[PDB]
Paper text:
Soluble epoxide hydrolase (sEH) is a ubiquitously expressed bifunctional enzyme encoded by the gene [name]. The protein harbors two distinct catalytic domains connected by a proline-rich linker. The bifunctional soluble epoxide hydrolase (sEH) represents a promising target for inflammation-related diseases. Proteolysis targeting chimeras ([name]) are heterobifunctional molecules that induce the ubiquitinylation and subsequent proteasomal degradation of a protein of interest (POI) by bringing the POI into close proximity with an E3 ligase, such as cereblon (CRBN) or the Von-Hippel-Lindau E3 ligase.
We rationalized that replacing the cyclopropane ring and attaching a linker to the sulfonamide moiety of 3 would lead to a short branch addressing sEH-H ligand, whereas functionalization at the indole-N would result in a long branch sEH-H ligand. Based on these results, we modified 3 at both attachment points with a C3-alkyl linker bearing a terminal alkyne group and obtained short branch addressing ligand 4 and long branch addressing ligand 5. For the set of [name] harboring PEG linkers, we used commercially available azide-functionalized pomalidomide derivatives (20a–20f) with linker lengths varying from PEG1 to PEG6. Both sEH-H ligands 4 and 5 were treated with 20a–20f under standard CuAAC conditions to obtain the corresponding [name] 21a–21f and 22a–22f. To validate the postulated binding modes of short branch vs long branch addressing [name], the two PEG2 exhibiting [name] 21b and 22b were cocrystallized with human sEH-H. The obtained cocrystal structures confirmed our hypothesis: while 21b addressed the exit of the short branch of the binding pocket, 22b (shown in orange) addressed the long branch exit. Right: 21b and 22b interact with asparagine 335 from the catalytic triad and tyrosine 446 and tyrosine 383. The PEG2-linkers and CRBN ligands were not resolved. None of the [name] harboring an alkyne linker (18a–e and 19a–e) decreased luminescence compared to DMSO-treated cells at any concentration or incubation time. The same was observed for long branch addressing compounds with PEG1-PEG6 (22a–22f) as well as short branch addressing compounds with PEG1-PEG4 linkers (21a–21d). The cocrystallization of selected [name] with sEH confirmed the proposed binding modes and helped rationalize the observed structure–activity relationships.
Residue numbers in the entry: 228 to 548
């Protein structure tokens, strides 16, 4: 396994981007700035195996707690977690740190964020990479309800819409929540089908799940502590802005993303499947690719060595000049 991170041994940074919104991050290394942006429901610590490797490779790594998570502010309002707001906060973040650009690397919902940073704020994005999450143009004549409603692997996302409902389930037992979610693809205890009909993500999963081969008890306990601070409302709110996000995305008009870009697919991610990235080169002329076999949704901890190799090779060729 690559070198990991001990939270107590990190430099912790805090930037107040607006009076009630402060973003926390950890920072390691010297060199071009690289901002890592985690997904749902994760932490800066999801990048624990990349942070040392990227610093050693000659980068200044900034690994965020995204809005709603960890030591970052978690306002309760849904609209505080739309992509327009979140992106403009990340621009302010760069402004406050005095960074003209950074490389943005995201996974999951953080991958969605870094694509829209590249699309709308390219002057601030040196280069962009996404783990798992594709860049899909907005169709200015089609409702975000129709698309998700089709693919049955997206049913749990409907369960996540009504405020308070999934929160109660996810907050009931945090240790069970993280052990149930953070599993390799072959170790899954969840069906992402008729979650609503089942009446919950965990209705039919072990009350005392085993520990995945991917994670230690101590690592699970770090997530548990973190989610004691603000719980799951802020995190879930990222899923509750589909219409708002679509309307914003439509404002890009025809425009392409013309900066250096990297799309990394994960063979065993059965939600964010590799095929969803097909034809991204139509919108992103300088796209490069990587692909990780035997890799489920939790890319950084499932295949940390492979992630590190792919990102370092791409950073050295395409982000440093
Ligand atoms: C085309 C972009 S998009 O489709 O709108 N999109 C962009 C980002 C994005 C994220 C999620 C998400 O649920 N991510 C969380 C997630 C994502 C995946 C899985 N598990 S799985 O069943 O896919 C496994 C890989 C086999 C579980 C979970 C969860 F909810 F439990 F945390 C879903 C959709 C997302």
């Amino acid at each position: 396994l690559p070198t990991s991170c001990n939270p107590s041994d990190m430099s912790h940074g805090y930037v107040t981007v607006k009076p009630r919104v402060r973003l926390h991050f950890v920072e390691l290394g010297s060199g071009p700035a690289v901002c890592l942006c985690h997904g749902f429901p994760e932490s800066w610590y999801s990048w624990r195996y990349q942070i040392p490797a990227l610093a050693q490779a000659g980068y200044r790594v900034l690994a965020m707690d995204m809005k709603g998570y960890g030591e970052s502010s978690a306002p309760p309002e849904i609209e505080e977690y739309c992509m327009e707001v979140l992106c403009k906060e990340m621009v302010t973040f760069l402004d406050k740190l005095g960074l003209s650009q950074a490389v943005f690397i995201g996974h999951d919902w953080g991958g969605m964020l870094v694509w829209y940073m590249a699309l709308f704020y390219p002057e601030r994005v040196r280069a962009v990479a996404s783990l798992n999450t594709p860049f899909i143009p907005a169709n200015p004549n089609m409702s975000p309800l129709e698309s998700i409603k089709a693919n049955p692997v997206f049913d749990y996302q409907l369960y996540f819409q009504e405020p308070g409902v999934a929160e109660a389930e996810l907050e009931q037992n945090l240790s069970r929540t993280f052990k149930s979610l953070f599993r390799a693809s072959d170790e899954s205890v969840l069906s992402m089908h008729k979650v609503c009909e089942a009446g919950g993500l965990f209705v039919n999963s072990p009350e005392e799940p085993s520990l995945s081969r991917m994670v230690t008890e101590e690592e699970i306990q770090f997530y548990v502590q973190q989610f004691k601070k603000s719980g799951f409302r802020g995190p879930l709110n990222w899923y509750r802005n589909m219409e708002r996000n679509w309307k914003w995305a439509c404002k890009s008009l025809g425009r392409k993303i013309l900066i250096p870009a990297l799309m990394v697919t994960a063979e065993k991610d059965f939600v964010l499947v590799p095929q969803m990235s097909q034809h991204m080169e139509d919108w992103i002329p300088h796209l490069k690719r990587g692909h990780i076999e035997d890799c489920g949704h939790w890319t950084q901890m499932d295949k940390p060595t492979e992630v590190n190799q792919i990102l370092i090779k791409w950073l050295d060729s395409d982000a440093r000049n």
